[PDB]
Each structure stands twice: as structure tokens, then as C-alpha cells.
């Protein structure tokens, strides 16, 4: 098995030691490109005859690591011509032997002749690969391309350029080995919007995503960002209005190239919701919180500050067109729900203290001061014993 094929490969790939000393004297040629390959494939196929289905692949895993163990690249090319016809006979499938070459660590970005030979060979044996195998090989080829740094010496650049045309042939939709819908998913998984890919990928992938431009136009909804719901206490929150609580975007189907307006934070929807009263049930729905679980969201304390400082300018502009300025009702609203927010302690108080200290440092707008400590008094009076004086 492994030892018999060890002996066979040892007698096949050997450059004989006593040879090349007192040389050029025999009247005998060695076995040529056909006879030596026939002699090796006979032992290979009789070894394969006593080989089980599970043991077919693993010896292949040795075979490449023996082939990568060789150092004469003419002998390596002879072994490549051996394996080109070995998989042609059907003894080895051109689906499991493709990743065996790449899986070896000897195929790095410094064995560039081995790189060119390997990529030419897997280009040649690409015919016996299904759509799933194509999807499996493209991602490992892509990350192997990603292993090369940005700037490498240009002595062996053309040896490394072969993968670009290999992928370009793979990406050809007329042959249709695999749909491009699966092809764009892995690239988008590695390279989302606003994320630069590797410099070896070239313009083609930048064109390849561009052909998916109408598809998102199928899913495009006009004026979706400007649409807003109504705040109600009836339950049954509409799932179309819901967002992503972690980073404030709408949920998206797939990884299609959506437009820019779907990638910014929608602070306006929660702005309109929290500015109106009775924003109690659906504020937990749009943030996905059940309100009994302690999460302590840090960014959720941001907009609560950003409303309060906004509550400064509504108390600062005139406050004289009306006696209350339509502000003391909103001051009561801010006193009511902001303390309910810290009732479950999802907003830690000294963080708001330092954020207000940072925000008011620089502007110096002090006109509606009388409210500012008063609601602060509403924090101090009602929460006198639940905390220490550190806050």
C-alpha cells in the first residue's frame, strides 16, 4: 500500500546516484515520456485496485506532498504530465485532486514555477468539476490570492498572473459552470460595501458586481428612507419598519449591492418616535429588547443625550412667542420617559454627566438653565438612596 507505492515512486522519480559519473557510455536510452508513464501507472493502478474508497484520497494527499517533495522542476513537469493523463483515465477524479495541490504548504507565493504549473494543471482538469466544486475552489483561490502582500518584487509577476485569467475563465457565464448569483456571494462575504479588495483581483470583479446593478433595482423601494410609521400602543409591530439594533440599518435580503441611503444610520425614525409621546412599547420592538434583560447598550445613551441638548435649543431660541413656548409640556415629557429609561438602568448616569459636560463645553449657550437642574433634581430626589455619591 503506502510502502509499496513508496518503493514505486522511489524507483520512478530517482535520478540515479552512480549516473553522471564516468558518464555517456551506455548504449541504452531510459524510458521515454510514454513508456515510463505506462510503467508507473501500472503499479499505480494495481495499488488503486486494492485501495478502498476512503483510502483513495489520502494517498493522493501523500502523492502531492511527494511531488512537492521533488526539486527538479523538469521532473515536476514530468509528474504533472503523468497526473494529467492519470486523471484522464478515470482512476483519479478531477474534483478531489484539485484542492490537494493547494492544500500543501509548499504551494506558497515563492514557488512561482510550481505556482504556474499548478494553476495551469487545475485549469486543464477543470472539466470534471461541478457547480459545488467550482464554488469550493473559487473561495480558496481568492484567499490564497489574498495571502500575497500589496507589493512583491516584479521578477515573478507573470508567473502569478495566471490565476487572474483562470478566474476570468471560471467567471464566464456563457460556459455556466456555476451561476454568478453564487459567485457574487463569496466576494461580498469577503469584501462588503466600502471595503477594498486585494489589488490582484483586477477590474473584472469590479465589473462583475456591476452587472448585478439591475437586480438590486428590482428590490429597490422608492423613498423607503423617507417613509415613517405612526406611533401606537396597539401592539403587533410591523416587521418592515424594524431595523438592526446593533448598527441602525434596515435588515437586508442577501448581499446584493444596495444603494448608499440604506447604509447610513436612520436616526430620523427613532427621532420621530421618541419626540412623540407614548413611545413605550415599540421602542423596545425596534431595538429588539424584551426590557427584562440587562444589556446596558452604550450607544443607546447617545441619542438620549442628543435629544436633551436638542431640548436646550427649543428652550433657547425665543421662548417668548408663547408663555410656555410649547416646551414645558415637552419638558414634562422629557422628565417622564427619560427617568423610565434609567428605571431599568439601560443608561448609566455619569456617562450622561460627562457627555453633557463635553457637549456644553464650547457652546456656552445658557438661556433655559432653570429646566436643566430641575429634571436633574428629578433624578436626584427620586433616586436618593439607590446609588452612592460617585454619580
Amino acid at each position: 500500500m503506502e510502502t509499496q507505492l513508496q518503493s514505486i515512486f522511489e524507483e520512478v522519480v530517482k535520478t540515479e546516484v552512480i549516473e553522471e559519473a564516468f558518464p555517456g557510455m551506455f548504449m541504452d536510452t531510459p524510458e521515454d515520456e510514454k513508456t515510463k508513464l505506462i510503467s508507473c501507472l501500472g503499479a499505480f493502478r494495481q495499488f488503486w485496485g486494492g485501495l478502498s474508497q476512503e483510502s483513495h484520497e489520502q494517498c493522493i494527499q501523500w502523492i502531492v506532498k511527494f511531488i512537492h517533495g521533488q526539486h527538479s522542476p523538469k521532473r515536476i513537469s514530468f509528474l504533472y504530465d503523468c497526473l494529467a493523463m492519470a486523471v484522464e483515465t478515470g482512476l483519479l477524479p478531477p474534483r478531489l485532486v484539485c484542492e490537494s495541490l493547494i492544500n500543501s504548504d509548499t504551494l506558497e507565493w515563492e514557488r512561482t514555477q510550481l505556482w504556474a504549473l499548478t494553476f495551469k494543471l487545475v485549469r486543464k482538469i477543470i472539466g470534471g468539476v461541478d457547480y459545488k466544486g467550482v464554488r469550493d475552489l473559487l473561495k480558496v483561490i481568492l484567499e490564497k490570492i489574498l495571502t500575497i502582500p500589496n507589493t512583491v518584487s516584479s521578477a515573478v509577476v507573470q508567473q502569478l498572473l495566471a490565476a487572474r485569467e483562470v478566474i476570468a475563465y471560471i467567471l464566464e457565464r456563457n460556459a455556466c459552470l456555476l451561476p454568478a448569483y453564487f459567485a457574487v456571494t463569496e466576494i461580498r462575504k469577503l469584501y462588503p460595501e466600502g471595503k477594498l479588495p486585494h489589488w490582484l483581483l483586477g477590474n473584472l470583479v469590479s465589473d462583475f458586481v456591476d452587472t448585478f446593478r439591475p437586480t438590486a433595482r428590482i428590490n429597490s423601494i422608492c423613498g423607503r428612507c423617507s417613509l415613517l410609521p405612526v406611533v401606537n400602543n396597539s401592539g403587533a409591530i410591523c416587521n418592515s419598519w424594524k431595523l438592526d439594533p446593533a448598527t441602525l440599518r434596515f435588515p437586508l435580503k442577501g448581499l446584493l449591492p444596495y444603494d448608499k441611503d440604506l447604509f447610513e444610520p436612520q436616526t430620523a425614525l427613532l427621532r420621530y418616535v421618541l419626540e412623540q409621546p407614548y413611545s413605550r412599547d415599540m421602542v423596545c420592538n425596534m431595538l429588539g429588547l424584551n426590557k427584562q434583560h440587562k444589556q446596558r447598550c452604550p450607544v443607546l445613551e447617545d441619542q438620549l443625550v442628543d435629544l436633551v441638548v436638542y431640548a436646550m435649543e427649543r428652550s433657547e431660541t425665543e421662548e417668548k412667542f408663547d408663555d410656555g413656548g410649547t416646551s414645558q409640556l415637552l419638558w414634562q415629557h422629557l422628565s417622564s420617559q427619560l427617568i423610565f429609561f434609567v428605571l431599568f438602568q439601560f443608561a448609566s448616569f455619569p456617562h450622561m454627566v460627562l457627555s453633557l459636560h463635553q457637549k456644553l463645553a464650547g457652546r456656552g449657550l445658557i438661556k433655559g438653565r432653570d429646566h436643566l437642574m430641575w429634571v436633574l433634581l428629578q433624578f436626584i430626589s427620586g433616586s436618593i438612596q439607590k446609588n452612592a455619591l460617585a454619580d
Partner: protein, 194 residues
């Protein structure tokens, strides 16, 4: 200052149409003072786009191609050659162009000076080894110089750069030969190396 503000904002894109709209708008915005942006883009911006190593990591498939098209739209138009305020602000200022660019048709016209200076930078990029995105940018440079050229805008080609394009690997070699009677023999030599 205005060019420096917008150039860094050009580096937020990954969608080719999305950056190409901005490039098309910036074409007209630069055409507001095309006579000056044809000399300040090639004067201090393009040397400032290649001096360091990591700075060409932004020069990629959408923005590098878009900027290369943007430059070649303006260059030809400046070769061909919009407000009273532009006439007002161009009166008083004087500038030593030789002090800025000592050059290592006329060779005193900054149209003939800075444009000829840029080809030295392209030769420096290509002749430098350790190929990266800079080689991609200079290969995207003149590939559109002939696309709009139905049929000299490229009269200032140095003679050493003719052999370089086949060193980095067509008909554009014959285009770069300028069909000169003195260029006839070196054109034959260049197409012999094929």
C-alpha cells in the same frame, strides 16, 4: 485647498457607477477652471499620489480608472484650449514654474511643461520594480489615450518609454510611435520585438 478636500473624499467608493457620477460632475466642476486644474492636477497632485508607498492602495479599480478617465478628458480639452471672476483672479499672481518644476513644442508653456513632466513620473513608476497598484494605474493611463483618439496630444512621448510598454506587455505600440520619419525605424524595431 479645494482639490485636497475632494481627493480624500474620492476614497470612499466601491461601486463604479457611484464614483463615476461624482467623476462626471467633477469634470464640469474642474471645467469651471480647466486651464488651472489641467496644470495643478498634473503638477502637485499626481506627484502627491505616488510619492509614498501605501498611498496608492486607494488607487484601485473603480477610483483609479475613474480618475484616469477624468484626467484624459481634461488633458485633451486643454490641448484644444467661463466667468469674469476667473479673469479677475488670474491677473495679479505670478509664479516661478521652473522653481516648482525644473524639467529635470515650446517647453516654456506650462501646458507643454507639466504634461511633459508627468511622463517622466510614469516612466519612473514603470521602470521601478516591485509591481503593485501603481503599475495598474499606469497601465490604465494610456489605454484610454487612444480610445478617444479616432486618428499631437501625445507629441511629448520620451523615446525611452516606447520600449517599456512591451516590457510590461499591441496596436498602442504603433500609436505611441507617432508615425515619425525618424520614428519609422524605431517603430519597426519596436514592432520587431513582438
Amino acid at each position: 485647498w479645494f482639490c485636497n478636500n475632494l481627493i480624500k473624499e474620492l476614497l470612499k467608493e466601491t461601486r463604479k457607477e457611484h464614483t463615476l457620477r461624482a467623476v462626471e460632475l467633477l469634470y464640469s466642476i474642474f471645467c469651471l477652471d480647466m486651464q488651472q486644474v489641467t496644470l495643478v492636477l498634473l503638477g502637485h497632485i499626481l506627484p502627491g499620489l505616488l510619492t509614498d508607498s501605501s498611498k496608492w492602495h486607494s488607487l484601485m479599480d473603480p477610483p483609479g480608472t475613474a480618475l484616469a478617465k477624468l484626467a484624459v478628458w481634461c488633458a485633451l480639452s486643454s490641448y484644444s484650449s467661463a466667468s469674469t471672476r476667473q479673469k479677475k483672479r488670474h491677473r495679479e499672481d505670478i509664479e516661478d514654474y521652473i522653481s516648482l518644476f525644473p524639467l529635470d513644442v515650446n517647453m516654456r508653456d506650462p501646458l507643454n511643461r507639466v504634461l511633459a513632466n508627468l511622463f517622466l513620473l510614469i516612466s519612473s513608476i514603470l521602470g521601478s520594480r516591485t509591481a503593485g497598484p501603481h503599475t495598474q494605474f499606469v497601465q490604465w493611463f494610456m489605454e484610454e489615450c487612444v480610445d478617444c483618439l479616432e486618428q499631437s496630444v501625445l507629441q511629448f512621448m520620451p523615446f525611452t518609454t516606447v520600449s517599456e510598454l512591451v516590457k510590461v506587455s499591441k496596436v498602442v505600440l504603433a500609436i505611441t510611435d507617432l508615425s515619425l520619419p525618424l520614428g519609422r525605424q524605431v517603430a519597426a524595431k519596436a514592432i520587431a520585438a513582438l
